[PDB]
mmCIF file of all heavy atoms in Angstrom:
data_model
loop_
_atom_site.group_PDB
_atom_site.id
_atom_site.type_symbol
_atom_site.label_atom_id
_atom_site.label_comp_id
_atom_site.label_asym_id
_atom_site.label_seq_id
_atom_site.Cartn_x
_atom_site.Cartn_y
_atom_site.Cartn_z
ATOM 1 N N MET A 156 114.342 -9.736 48.017
ATOM 2 C CA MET A 156 113.367 -10.776 48.445
ATOM 3 C C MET A 156 111.954 -10.320 48.129
ATOM 4 O O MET A 156 111.630 -9.144 48.318
ATOM 5 C CB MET A 156 113.491 -11.033 49.956
ATOM 6 C CG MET A 156 112.808 -12.321 50.410
ATOM 7 S SD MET A 156 112.542 -12.498 52.187
ATOM 8 C CE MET A 156 111.410 -11.155 52.531
ATOM 9 N N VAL A 157 111.092 -11.231 47.682
ATOM 10 C CA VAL A 157 109.670 -10.881 47.529
ATOM 11 C C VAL A 157 109.005 -10.797 48.905
ATOM 12 O O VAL A 157 109.171 -11.671 49.754
ATOM 13 C CB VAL A 157 108.853 -11.836 46.607
ATOM 14 C CG1 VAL A 157 109.425 -11.839 45.210
ATOM 15 C CG2 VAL A 157 108.740 -13.239 47.183
ATOM 16 N N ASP A 158 108.259 -9.723 49.100
ATOM 17 C CA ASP A 158 107.477 -9.502 50.293
ATOM 18 C C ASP A 158 106.106 -10.080 49.977
ATOM 19 O O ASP A 158 105.377 -9.512 49.186
ATOM 20 C CB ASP A 158 107.432 -7.992 50.543
ATOM 21 C CG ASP A 158 106.646 -7.601 51.769
ATOM 22 O OD1 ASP A 158 105.603 -8.207 52.061
ATOM 23 O OD2 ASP A 158 106.991 -6.620 52.479
ATOM 24 N N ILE A 159 105.763 -11.215 50.579
ATOM 25 C CA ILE A 159 104.580 -11.976 50.133
ATOM 26 C C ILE A 159 103.297 -11.152 50.265
ATOM 27 O O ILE A 159 102.496 -11.061 49.315
ATOM 28 C CB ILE A 159 104.481 -13.318 50.907
ATOM 29 C CG1 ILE A 159 105.659 -14.205 50.532
ATOM 30 C CG2 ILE A 159 103.175 -14.051 50.587
ATOM 31 C CD1 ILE A 159 105.894 -15.342 51.467
ATOM 32 N N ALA A 160 103.098 -10.557 51.431
ATOM 33 C CA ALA A 160 101.884 -9.789 51.674
ATOM 34 C C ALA A 160 101.805 -8.574 50.751
ATOM 35 O O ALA A 160 100.728 -8.221 50.274
ATOM 36 C CB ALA A 160 101.780 -9.349 53.163
ATOM 37 N N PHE A 161 102.944 -7.930 50.504
ATOM 38 C CA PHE A 161 102.993 -6.803 49.565
ATOM 39 C C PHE A 161 102.699 -7.239 48.120
ATOM 40 O O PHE A 161 101.999 -6.524 47.397
ATOM 41 C CB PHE A 161 104.360 -6.114 49.656
ATOM 42 C CG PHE A 161 104.479 -4.848 48.849
ATOM 43 C CD1 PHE A 161 103.997 -3.642 49.328
ATOM 44 C CD2 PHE A 161 105.140 -4.855 47.628
ATOM 45 C CE1 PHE A 161 104.130 -2.472 48.567
ATOM 46 C CE2 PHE A 161 105.280 -3.711 46.889
ATOM 47 C CZ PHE A 161 104.751 -2.525 47.348
ATOM 48 N N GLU A 162 103.216 -8.394 47.710
ATOM 49 C CA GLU A 162 102.909 -8.913 46.353
ATOM 50 C C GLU A 162 101.439 -9.331 46.251
ATOM 51 O O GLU A 162 100.827 -9.185 45.187
ATOM 52 C CB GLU A 162 103.810 -10.089 45.963
ATOM 53 C CG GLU A 162 105.273 -9.711 45.764
ATOM 54 C CD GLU A 162 105.519 -8.574 44.792
ATOM 55 O OE1 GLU A 162 104.761 -8.379 43.800
ATOM 56 O OE2 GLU A 162 106.517 -7.849 45.030
ATOM 57 N N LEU A 163 100.868 -9.823 47.343
ATOM 58 C CA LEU A 163 99.426 -10.107 47.361
ATOM 59 C C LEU A 163 98.594 -8.846 47.147
ATOM 60 O O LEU A 163 97.613 -8.832 46.394
ATOM 61 C CB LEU A 163 99.012 -10.786 48.650
ATOM 62 C CG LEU A 163 99.374 -12.276 48.694
ATOM 63 C CD1 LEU A 163 99.210 -12.805 50.112
ATOM 64 C CD2 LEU A 163 98.521 -13.043 47.670
ATOM 65 N N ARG A 164 99.002 -7.757 47.779
ATOM 66 C CA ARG A 164 98.306 -6.492 47.572
ATOM 67 C C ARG A 164 98.388 -6.000 46.124
ATOM 68 O O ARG A 164 97.428 -5.429 45.606
ATOM 69 C CB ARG A 164 98.825 -5.443 48.541
ATOM 70 C CG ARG A 164 98.490 -5.752 49.967
ATOM 71 C CD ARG A 164 98.296 -4.516 50.814
ATOM 72 N NE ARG A 164 99.025 -3.396 50.264
ATOM 73 C CZ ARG A 164 100.342 -3.224 50.338
ATOM 74 N NH1 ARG A 164 101.111 -4.094 50.991
ATOM 75 N NH2 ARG A 164 100.889 -2.162 49.765
ATOM 76 N N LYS A 165 99.509 -6.268 45.459
ATOM 77 C CA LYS A 165 99.672 -5.915 44.036
ATOM 78 C C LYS A 165 98.773 -6.766 43.168
ATOM 79 O O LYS A 165 98.132 -6.247 42.266
ATOM 80 C CB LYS A 165 101.132 -6.014 43.597
ATOM 81 C CG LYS A 165 101.942 -4.789 43.999
ATOM 82 C CD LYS A 165 103.300 -4.815 43.376
ATOM 83 C CE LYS A 165 104.002 -3.502 43.497
ATOM 84 N NZ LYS A 165 105.282 -3.518 42.829
ATOM 85 N N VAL A 166 98.685 -8.064 43.460
ATOM 86 C CA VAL A 166 97.732 -8.916 42.763
ATOM 87 C C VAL A 166 96.300 -8.375 42.945
ATOM 88 O O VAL A 166 95.535 -8.280 41.996
ATOM 89 C CB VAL A 166 97.767 -10.362 43.261
ATOM 90 C CG1 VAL A 166 96.600 -11.182 42.646
ATOM 91 C CG2 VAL A 166 99.108 -11.014 42.952
ATOM 92 N N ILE A 167 95.946 -8.019 44.175
ATOM 93 C CA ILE A 167 94.603 -7.531 44.460
ATOM 94 C C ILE A 167 94.317 -6.288 43.634
ATOM 95 O O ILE A 167 93.204 -6.078 43.142
ATOM 96 C CB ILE A 167 94.427 -7.239 45.988
ATOM 97 C CG1 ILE A 167 94.360 -8.544 46.762
ATOM 98 C CG2 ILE A 167 93.161 -6.405 46.249
ATOM 99 C CD1 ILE A 167 94.661 -8.387 48.257
ATOM 100 N N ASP A 168 95.338 -5.454 43.472
ATOM 101 C CA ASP A 168 95.208 -4.246 42.704
ATOM 102 C C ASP A 168 95.141 -4.523 41.197
ATOM 103 O O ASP A 168 94.113 -4.240 40.569
ATOM 104 C CB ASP A 168 96.366 -3.318 43.027
ATOM 105 C CG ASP A 168 96.304 -2.035 42.239
ATOM 106 O OD1 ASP A 168 95.265 -1.351 42.130
ATOM 107 O OD2 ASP A 168 97.325 -1.653 41.659
ATOM 108 N N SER A 169 96.205 -5.113 40.634
ATOM 109 C CA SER A 169 96.366 -5.174 39.182
ATOM 110 C C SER A 169 96.135 -6.561 38.563
ATOM 111 O O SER A 169 95.992 -6.682 37.344
ATOM 112 C CB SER A 169 97.752 -4.635 38.795
ATOM 113 O OG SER A 169 98.778 -5.430 39.352
ATOM 114 N N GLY A 170 96.086 -7.592 39.404
ATOM 115 C CA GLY A 170 95.881 -8.966 38.937
ATOM 116 C C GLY A 170 94.462 -9.439 39.159
ATOM 117 O O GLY A 170 93.551 -8.653 39.323
ATOM 118 N N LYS A 171 94.285 -10.743 39.193
ATOM 119 C CA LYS A 171 92.991 -11.341 39.484
ATOM 120 C C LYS A 171 93.196 -12.535 40.395
ATOM 121 O O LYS A 171 94.148 -13.268 40.247
ATOM 122 C CB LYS A 171 92.271 -11.772 38.201
ATOM 123 C CG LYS A 171 91.958 -10.622 37.268
ATOM 124 C CD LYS A 171 91.326 -11.052 35.979
ATOM 125 C CE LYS A 171 90.775 -9.865 35.210
ATOM 126 N NZ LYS A 171 91.873 -8.970 34.791
ATOM 127 N N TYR A 172 92.286 -12.726 41.339
ATOM 128 C CA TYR A 172 92.410 -13.793 42.310
ATOM 129 C C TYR A 172 91.027 -14.247 42.758
ATOM 130 O O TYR A 172 90.028 -13.577 42.511
ATOM 131 C CB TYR A 172 93.245 -13.326 43.519
ATOM 132 C CG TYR A 172 92.516 -12.332 44.390
ATOM 133 C CD1 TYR A 172 91.879 -12.731 45.572
ATOM 134 C CD2 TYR A 172 92.441 -10.982 44.029
ATOM 135 C CE1 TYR A 172 91.187 -11.811 46.357
ATOM 136 C CE2 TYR A 172 91.758 -10.065 44.800
ATOM 137 C CZ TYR A 172 91.141 -10.467 45.961
ATOM 138 O OH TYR A 172 90.455 -9.537 46.717
ATOM 139 N N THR A 173 90.987 -15.404 43.410
ATOM 140 C CA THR A 173 89.814 -15.833 44.145
ATOM 141 C C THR A 173 90.258 -16.483 45.462
ATOM 142 O O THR A 173 91.444 -16.770 45.647
ATOM 143 C CB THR A 173 88.941 -16.747 43.312
ATOM 144 O OG1 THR A 173 87.648 -16.901 43.944
ATOM 145 C CG2 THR A 173 89.546 -18.140 43.207
ATOM 146 N N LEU A 174 89.319 -16.618 46.388
ATOM 147 C CA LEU A 174 89.635 -17.004 47.774
ATOM 148 C C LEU A 174 88.770 -18.148 48.228
ATOM 149 O O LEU A 174 87.578 -18.233 47.891
ATOM 150 C CB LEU A 174 89.394 -15.868 48.764
ATOM 151 C CG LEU A 174 90.067 -14.519 48.539
ATOM 152 C CD1 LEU A 174 89.540 -13.505 49.549
ATOM 153 C CD2 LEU A 174 91.567 -14.633 48.628
ATOM 154 N N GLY A 175 89.372 -18.992 49.039
ATOM 155 C CA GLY A 175 88.639 -20.022 49.759
ATOM 156 C C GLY A 175 88.589 -21.336 49.014
ATOM 157 O O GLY A 175 88.878 -21.416 47.811
ATOM 158 N N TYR A 176 88.228 -22.370 49.764
ATOM 159 C CA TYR A 176 88.228 -23.746 49.252
ATOM 160 C C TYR A 176 87.379 -23.946 47.976
ATOM 161 O O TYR A 176 87.916 -24.401 46.951
ATOM 162 C CB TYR A 176 87.776 -24.693 50.369
ATOM 163 C CG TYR A 176 87.646 -26.110 49.924
ATOM 164 C CD1 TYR A 176 88.764 -26.935 49.867
ATOM 165 C CD2 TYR A 176 86.404 -26.646 49.565
ATOM 166 C CE1 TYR A 176 88.656 -28.256 49.470
ATOM 167 C CE2 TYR A 176 86.297 -27.979 49.135
ATOM 168 C CZ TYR A 176 87.424 -28.769 49.102
ATOM 169 O OH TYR A 176 87.326 -30.087 48.691
ATOM 170 N N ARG A 177 86.068 -23.675 48.033
ATOM 171 C CA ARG A 177 85.209 -23.991 46.879
ATOM 172 C C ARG A 177 85.667 -23.312 45.588
ATOM 173 O O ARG A 177 85.775 -23.946 44.535
ATOM 174 C CB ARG A 177 83.737 -23.666 47.207
ATOM 175 C CG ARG A 177 82.808 -23.890 46.028
ATOM 176 C CD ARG A 177 81.334 -23.683 46.305
ATOM 177 N NE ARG A 177 80.863 -24.568 47.347
ATOM 178 C CZ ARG A 177 79.612 -24.597 47.793
ATOM 179 N NH1 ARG A 177 78.682 -23.802 47.273
ATOM 180 N NH2 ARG A 177 79.296 -25.447 48.758
ATOM 181 N N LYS A 178 85.954 -22.007 45.655
ATOM 182 C CA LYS A 178 86.290 -21.272 44.438
ATOM 183 C C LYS A 178 87.680 -21.678 43.946
ATOM 184 O O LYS A 178 87.949 -21.670 42.736
ATOM 185 C CB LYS A 178 86.163 -19.771 44.660
ATOM 186 C CG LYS A 178 84.699 -19.404 44.995
ATOM 187 C CD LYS A 178 84.252 -18.098 44.398
ATOM 188 C CE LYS A 178 84.883 -16.896 45.078
ATOM 189 N NZ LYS A 178 85.673 -17.202 46.301
ATOM 190 N N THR A 179 88.563 -22.021 44.871
ATOM 191 C CA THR A 179 89.906 -22.437 44.497
ATOM 192 C C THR A 179 89.828 -23.783 43.787
ATOM 193 O O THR A 179 90.422 -23.967 42.718
ATOM 194 C CB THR A 179 90.838 -22.479 45.707
ATOM 195 O OG1 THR A 179 91.123 -21.147 46.142
ATOM 196 C CG2 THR A 179 92.211 -23.039 45.296
ATOM 197 N N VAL A 180 89.059 -24.703 44.343
ATOM 198 C CA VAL A 180 88.901 -26.008 43.717
ATOM 199 C C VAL A 180 88.321 -25.848 42.301
ATOM 200 O O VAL A 180 88.809 -26.485 41.347
ATOM 201 C CB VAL A 180 88.017 -26.936 44.580
ATOM 202 C CG1 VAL A 180 87.579 -28.178 43.804
ATOM 203 C CG2 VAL A 180 88.755 -27.349 45.840
ATOM 204 N N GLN A 181 87.319 -25.000 42.138
ATOM 205 C CA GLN A 181 86.796 -24.700 40.818
ATOM 206 C C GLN A 181 87.907 -24.217 39.889
ATOM 207 O O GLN A 181 88.023 -24.657 38.737
ATOM 208 C CB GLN A 181 85.697 -23.644 40.864
ATOM 209 C CG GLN A 181 85.051 -23.419 39.493
ATOM 210 C CD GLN A 181 84.299 -22.109 39.380
ATOM 211 O OE1 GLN A 181 83.731 -21.619 40.368
ATOM 212 N NE2 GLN A 181 84.292 -21.535 38.172
ATOM 213 N N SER A 182 88.728 -23.286 40.390
ATOM 214 C CA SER A 182 89.771 -22.706 39.553
ATOM 215 C C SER A 182 90.798 -23.747 39.116
ATOM 216 O O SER A 182 91.440 -23.593 38.079
ATOM 217 C CB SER A 182 90.449 -21.520 40.244
ATOM 218 O OG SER A 182 91.354 -21.915 41.258
ATOM 219 N N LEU A 183 90.966 -24.801 39.895
ATOM 220 C CA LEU A 183 91.923 -25.866 39.555
ATOM 221 C C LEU A 183 91.337 -26.886 38.570
ATOM 222 O O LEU A 183 92.011 -27.296 37.593
ATOM 223 C CB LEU A 183 92.403 -26.570 40.825
ATOM 224 C CG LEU A 183 93.219 -25.717 41.792
ATOM 225 C CD1 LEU A 183 93.263 -26.306 43.177
ATOM 226 C CD2 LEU A 183 94.619 -25.498 41.240
ATOM 227 N N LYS A 184 90.087 -27.277 38.819
ATOM 228 C CA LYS A 184 89.374 -28.213 37.945
ATOM 229 C C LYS A 184 89.172 -27.597 36.569
ATOM 230 O O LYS A 184 89.258 -28.301 35.546
ATOM 231 C CB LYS A 184 88.024 -28.578 38.544
ATOM 232 C CG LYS A 184 88.092 -29.353 39.813
ATOM 233 C CD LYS A 184 86.680 -29.560 40.337
ATOM 234 C CE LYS A 184 86.608 -30.633 41.360
ATOM 235 N NZ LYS A 184 85.215 -30.756 41.899
ATOM 236 N N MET A 185 88.919 -26.291 36.539
ATOM 237 C CA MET A 185 88.712 -25.546 35.287
ATOM 238 C C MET A 185 89.973 -24.960 34.630
ATOM 239 O O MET A 185 89.916 -24.485 33.484
ATOM 240 C CB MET A 185 87.711 -24.433 35.526
ATOM 241 C CG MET A 185 86.396 -24.952 36.017
ATOM 242 S SD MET A 185 85.105 -23.768 35.661
ATOM 243 C CE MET A 185 84.847 -24.209 33.938
ATOM 244 N N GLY A 186 91.101 -25.023 35.326
ATOM 245 C CA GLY A 186 92.398 -24.630 34.739
ATOM 246 C C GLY A 186 92.686 -23.133 34.723
ATOM 247 O O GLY A 186 93.578 -22.691 33.996
ATOM 248 N N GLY A 187 91.929 -22.344 35.496
ATOM 249 C CA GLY A 187 92.113 -20.888 35.591
ATOM 250 C C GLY A 187 93.193 -20.440 36.586
ATOM 251 O O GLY A 187 93.652 -19.304 36.539
ATOM 252 N N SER A 188 93.616 -21.327 37.478
ATOM 253 C CA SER A 188 94.605 -20.969 38.493
ATOM 254 C C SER A 188 96.018 -21.036 37.937
ATOM 255 O O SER A 188 96.372 -21.954 37.197
ATOM 256 C CB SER A 188 94.508 -21.893 39.709
ATOM 257 O OG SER A 188 95.399 -21.454 40.726
ATOM 258 N N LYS A 189 96.829 -20.072 38.359
ATOM 259 C CA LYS A 189 98.263 -20.018 38.040
ATOM 260 C C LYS A 189 99.151 -20.469 39.210
ATOM 261 O O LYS A 189 100.345 -20.723 39.035
ATOM 262 C CB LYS A 189 98.639 -18.586 37.684
ATOM 263 C CG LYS A 189 97.762 -17.953 36.602
ATOM 264 C CD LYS A 189 97.640 -18.782 35.346
ATOM 265 C CE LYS A 189 96.938 -18.037 34.214
ATOM 266 N NZ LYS A 189 95.497 -17.920 34.422
ATOM 267 N N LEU A 190 98.562 -20.503 40.408
ATOM 268 C CA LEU A 190 99.279 -20.748 41.660
ATOM 269 C C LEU A 190 98.257 -20.724 42.774
ATOM 270 O O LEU A 190 97.364 -19.866 42.773
ATOM 271 C CB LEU A 190 100.307 -19.653 41.930
ATOM 272 C CG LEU A 190 101.001 -19.631 43.315
ATOM 273 C CD1 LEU A 190 101.962 -20.742 43.411
ATOM 274 C CD2 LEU A 190 101.716 -18.301 43.542
ATOM 275 N N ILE A 191 98.395 -21.631 43.730
ATOM 276 C CA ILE A 191 97.605 -21.505 44.952
ATOM 277 C C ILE A 191 98.532 -21.353 46.149
ATOM 278 O O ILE A 191 99.620 -21.932 46.202
ATOM 279 C CB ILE A 191 96.581 -22.683 45.104
ATOM 280 C CG1 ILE A 191 97.282 -24.033 45.375
ATOM 281 C CG2 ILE A 191 95.699 -22.758 43.872
ATOM 282 C CD1 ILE A 191 96.283 -25.132 45.749
ATOM 283 N N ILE A 192 98.061 -20.570 47.122
ATOM 284 C CA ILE A 192 98.791 -20.242 48.332
ATOM 285 C C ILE A 192 97.927 -20.721 49.485
ATOM 286 O O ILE A 192 96.831 -20.186 49.708
ATOM 287 C CB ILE A 192 98.998 -18.729 48.440
ATOM 288 C CG1 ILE A 192 99.872 -18.203 47.274
ATOM 289 C CG2 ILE A 192 99.611 -18.350 49.808
ATOM 290 C CD1 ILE A 192 99.785 -16.713 47.083
ATOM 291 N N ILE A 193 98.418 -21.745 50.181
ATOM 292 C CA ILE A 193 97.619 -22.447 51.213
ATOM 293 C C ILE A 193 98.123 -22.077 52.604
ATOM 294 O O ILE A 193 99.304 -22.161 52.856
ATOM 295 C CB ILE A 193 97.694 -23.986 51.034
ATOM 296 C CG1 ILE A 193 97.295 -24.440 49.619
ATOM 297 C CG2 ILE A 193 96.732 -24.659 52.057
ATOM 298 C CD1 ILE A 193 97.456 -25.922 49.388
ATOM 299 N N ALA A 194 97.216 -21.692 53.489
ATOM 300 C CA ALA A 194 97.537 -21.387 54.893
ATOM 301 C C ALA A 194 98.034 -22.622 55.604
ATOM 302 O O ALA A 194 97.547 -23.730 55.370
ATOM 303 C CB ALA A 194 96.319 -20.863 55.606
ATOM 304 N N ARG A 195 98.994 -22.452 56.511
ATOM 305 C CA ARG A 195 99.535 -23.606 57.209
ATOM 306 C C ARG A 195 98.504 -24.429 57.981
ATOM 307 O O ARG A 195 98.617 -25.651 58.052
ATOM 308 C CB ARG A 195 100.640 -23.177 58.155
ATOM 309 C CG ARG A 195 101.474 -24.329 58.669
ATOM 310 C CD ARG A 195 102.923 -23.969 58.921
ATOM 311 N NE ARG A 195 103.155 -23.412 60.247
ATOM 312 C CZ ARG A 195 103.239 -24.128 61.373
ATOM 313 N NH1 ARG A 195 103.090 -25.458 61.361
ATOM 314 N NH2 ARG A 195 103.466 -23.508 62.528
ATOM 315 N N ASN A 196 97.497 -23.768 58.529
ATOM 316 C CA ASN A 196 96.516 -24.432 59.389
ATOM 317 C C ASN A 196 95.145 -24.632 58.737
ATOM 318 O O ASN A 196 94.122 -24.816 59.394
ATOM 319 C CB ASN A 196 96.390 -23.665 60.717
ATOM 320 C CG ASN A 196 95.695 -22.359 60.544
ATOM 321 O OD1 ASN A 196 95.906 -21.684 59.537
ATOM 322 N ND2 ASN A 196 94.831 -22.008 61.487
ATOM 323 N N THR A 197 95.132 -24.662 57.408
ATOM 324 C CA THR A 197 93.969 -25.040 56.692
ATOM 325 C C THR A 197 93.545 -26.424 57.121
ATOM 326 O O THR A 197 94.376 -27.316 57.307
ATOM 327 C CB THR A 197 94.249 -24.960 55.175
ATOM 328 O OG1 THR A 197 94.378 -23.566 54.825
ATOM 329 C CG2 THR A 197 93.083 -25.442 54.366
ATOM 330 N N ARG A 198 92.241 -26.561 57.283
ATOM 331 C CA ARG A 198 91.645 -27.803 57.788
ATOM 332 C C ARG A 198 92.209 -28.957 56.953
ATOM 333 O O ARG A 198 92.172 -28.896 55.721
ATOM 334 C CB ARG A 198 90.130 -27.759 57.731
ATOM 335 C CG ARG A 198 89.468 -28.769 58.654
ATOM 336 C CD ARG A 198 87.983 -28.628 58.656
ATOM 337 N NE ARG A 198 87.397 -29.285 57.504
ATOM 338 C CZ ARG A 198 86.153 -29.108 57.059
ATOM 339 N NH1 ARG A 198 85.343 -28.183 57.575
ATOM 340 N NH2 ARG A 198 85.739 -29.856 56.055
ATOM 341 N N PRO A 199 92.825 -29.926 57.618
ATOM 342 C CA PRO A 199 93.595 -30.956 56.906
ATOM 343 C C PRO A 199 92.916 -31.623 55.705
ATOM 344 O O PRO A 199 93.593 -31.901 54.704
ATOM 345 C CB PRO A 199 93.898 -31.981 57.991
ATOM 346 C CG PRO A 199 94.023 -31.179 59.223
ATOM 347 C CD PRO A 199 93.036 -30.018 59.082
ATOM 348 N N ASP A 200 91.620 -31.912 55.795
ATOM 349 C CA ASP A 200 90.950 -32.574 54.665
ATOM 350 C C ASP A 200 90.869 -31.630 53.496
ATOM 351 O O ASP A 200 91.128 -31.989 52.345
ATOM 352 C CB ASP A 200 89.565 -33.121 55.019
ATOM 353 C CG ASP A 200 88.663 -32.089 55.643
ATOM 354 O OD1 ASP A 200 89.089 -31.066 56.232
ATOM 355 O OD2 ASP A 200 87.439 -32.308 55.601
ATOM 356 N N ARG A 201 90.534 -30.370 53.774
ATOM 357 C CA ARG A 201 90.498 -29.380 52.722
ATOM 358 C C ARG A 201 91.895 -29.153 52.122
ATOM 359 O O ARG A 201 92.031 -28.986 50.922
ATOM 360 C CB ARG A 201 89.934 -28.067 53.248
ATOM 361 C CG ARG A 201 88.502 -28.090 53.676
ATOM 362 C CD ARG A 201 88.061 -26.691 54.084
ATOM 363 N NE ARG A 201 86.725 -26.574 54.655
ATOM 364 C CZ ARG A 201 85.591 -26.513 53.970
ATOM 365 N NH1 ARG A 201 85.572 -26.592 52.656
ATOM 366 N NH2 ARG A 201 84.444 -26.391 54.624
ATOM 367 N N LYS A 202 92.923 -29.160 52.969
ATOM 368 C CA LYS A 202 94.310 -28.970 52.547
ATOM 369 C C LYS A 202 94.756 -30.087 51.639
ATOM 370 O O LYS A 202 95.296 -29.838 50.552
ATOM 371 C CB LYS A 202 95.219 -28.891 53.779
ATOM 372 C CG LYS A 202 96.614 -28.478 53.467
ATOM 373 C CD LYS A 202 97.431 -28.345 54.729
ATOM 374 C CE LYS A 202 98.547 -27.364 54.560
ATOM 375 N NZ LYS A 202 99.376 -27.305 55.804
#
């Protein structure tokens, strides 16, 4: 099984990422994102 938090730490180490609503939206509009991971309780409009 993939350990999500452990795979996130590997991304932080050897991959590239960005965090939060504004930068994530940019990454989607600009096509740089490969995957987004959304918190369950993200503010509904932002979600």
